[PDB]
Amino acid sequence: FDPFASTRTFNLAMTDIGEMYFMPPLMEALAQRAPHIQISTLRPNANLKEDMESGAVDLALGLLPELQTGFFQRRLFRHRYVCMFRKDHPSAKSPMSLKQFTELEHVGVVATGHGEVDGLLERAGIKRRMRLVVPHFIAIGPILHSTDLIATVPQRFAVRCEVPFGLTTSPHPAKLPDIAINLFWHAKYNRDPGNMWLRQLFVELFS
């Protein structure tokens, strides 16, 4: 298998967060390393497991607990939930006190586990004033920029939003779980030249 020569198409399951986290650097990497490969990505919900066997999908990335049968996996990284708001929010502060967190208004994302973030808050007596609720993360960044709403966001998602949308963060005041993002491949392809190649490239660019 020669990367610089290959015209193969690799297919990857990953979340939306995982999409705008992973792809940008990856594409930049590939531009110089494998200039003729093609990449396609899809969501873990449109389905998988079978597809990984069939060779329809090559790798998958996320907090996929479902996968644990004929599935090798390597941890890339963990990261924490953070609290994100516009740089000049009228009254938000870092580190945010849990007391203040209760008090402000939030946008919540329904969405990988995650999470069940909102479960832990509610059980700890903390009832957020939930002004908006969205299914996934695309609009989050703009929304914070144009309003005084705060959000509970995964750390590496925050990172890629701070500049474009002019927002900052705070360590999260509540006790929430760490986020363990993993790389998964089907055993049947453990010894596939090209697949191992992609695997290592990920491990390389992320860790």
Q: Is residue 59 within the footprint of ligand SAL (CB under 6 A)?
A: no
Q: Is residue 12 within the footprint of ligand SAL (CB under 6 A)?
A: no
- Among 12, 150, 179, 183, indicate the residue that binds ligand SAL (CB under 6 A): 179
Q: Is residue 44 within the footprint of ligand SAL (CB under 6 A)?
A: no
- Contact predicate 7/38, CB 8 Å: yes
Q: Is residue 17 within the footprint of ligand SAL (CB under 6 A)?
A: yes
Q: Tell me which stretch binds ligand SAL (CB under 6 A): 9-17, 24-32, 123-131, 161-169.
A: 9-17
> Vertex 179, ends 174 and 181: CA angle to 5°?
170
Residue with tokens 């004929």: 70
- Contact predicate 144/150, CB 8 Å: yes
State the binding partner of 53 from ligand SAL, its own copies, none, CB within 5 to 8 A by kind.
none
Q: Is residue 141 within the footprint of its own copies (CB under 8 A)?
A: yes
First-to-last CA distance in the chain?
Answer: 25
C-beta closer to ligand SAL: residue 35 or 65: 65
Return d(Cα 71, Cα 177) in angstroms, integer.
24
> From start to end of the chain, where are the E strands?
9-14, 38-42, 59-62, 71-79, 81-86, 105-109, 129-134, 150-154, 167-171, 179-186
Q: Supply the Cα-derived Rg of the chain in whole angstroms.
A: 19
- Report, in Å, the least distance between residue 190 CB and its own copies: 26
Q: Is residue 134 within the footprint of its own copies (CB under 8 A)?
A: yes
State the binding partner of 133 from ligand SAL, its own copies, none, CB within 5 to 8 A by kind.
its own copies
Binding site for ligand SAL (CB under 6 A): 14-15, 17-18, 21, 61-63, 112, 154, 156-157, 179, 181
